[PDB]
Curated annotation (Swiss-Prot):
Catalytic activity: Thiol-dependent hydrolysis of ester, thioester, amide, peptide and isopeptide bonds formed by the C-terminal Gly of ubiquitin (a 76-residue protein attached to proteins as an intracellular targeting signal)
Membrane topology: Multi-pass membrane protein
The gene coding this protein: rep
Protein name: Papain-like protease nsp3
Activity regulation (UniProt): Inhibited in vitro by GRL-0617.
Subunit structure: May form homohexamers. Interacts with N protein.
Role of this protein: Responsible for the cleavages located at the N-terminus of the replicase polyprotein. Participates together with nsp4 in the assembly of virally-induced cytoplasmic double-membrane vesicles necessary for viral replication. Antagonizes innate immune induction of type I interferon by blocking the phosphorylation, dimerization and subsequent nuclear translocation of host IRF3. Also prevents host NF-kappa-B signaling. In addition, PL-PRO possesses a deubiquitinating/deISGylating activity and processes both 'Lys-48'- and 'Lys-63'-linked polyubiquitin chains from cellular substrates.
Residues included from the entire protein: 1025 to 1191 of 7096
Length: 167
């Protein structure tokens, strides 16, 4: 039993809700919140910009030190950093950005990072400003993640489309 509330159950392990991931994280304080990161951990917009703003830029400060030490992530890769005031940990995961010409096949590799964590609050990878089809992202999530994932979909219209079309 966990403290996630109001989610629709899609499969044994995948749940979904129309919610602002920032507000969800502040309420639940999950062990792991997933960020829709880029390889530079530059948290400018989309989910990343919103999470970082909610940390008063502490996420960006920590991320800049991470990059200075380790260099950029790989597309499809991840790193674990602090969750600041939002969660215990933040799993920064880089899905392919279609608006940069990146290989959508890397979406499965991106979701595989979730399997290293028993429970996560997460967005749909590569959706939104990353330019991929969110229906596809949900399908890859369900077919790749085996741990317990609570998906927050900000756009209510998109949420209804995702539920109604789910196979
Ligand atoms: C129509 N539309 C698609 C998306 C993409 C989605 C991630 O896939 N973004 C977010 N998801 C959850 N919480 C969030 N907070 C801030 C952004 C955000 C947003 N709008
Ligand atoms: Cl977005």
């Amino acid at each position: 039993v966990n403290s996630f509330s109001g989610y629709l159950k899609l499969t044994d392990n995948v749940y979904i809700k129309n919610a602002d991931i920032v507000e969800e994280a502040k309420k639940v304080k999950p062990t792991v919140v997933v960020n829709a990161a880029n390889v530079y951990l530059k948290h400018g917009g989309g989910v990343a910009g919103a999470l970082n703003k909610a940390t008063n830029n502490a996420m960006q400060v920590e991320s800049d030190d991470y990059i200075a030490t380790n260099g950029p992530l790989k597309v499809g890769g991840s790193c674990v950093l602090s969750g600041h005031n939002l969660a215990k940990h933040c799993l920064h995961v880089v899905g392919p950005n279609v608006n940069k010409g990146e290989d959508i096949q890397l979406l499965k590799s991106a979701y595989e990072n979730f399997n290293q964590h028993e429970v996560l609050l997460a967005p749909l990878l590569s959706a939104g400003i990353f330019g991929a089809d969110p229906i596809h992202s949900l399908r890859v999530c369900v077919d790749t993640v085996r741990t317990n994932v609570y998906l927050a979909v900000f756009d209510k219209n998109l949420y209804d489309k995702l539920v109604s079309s789910f196979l």
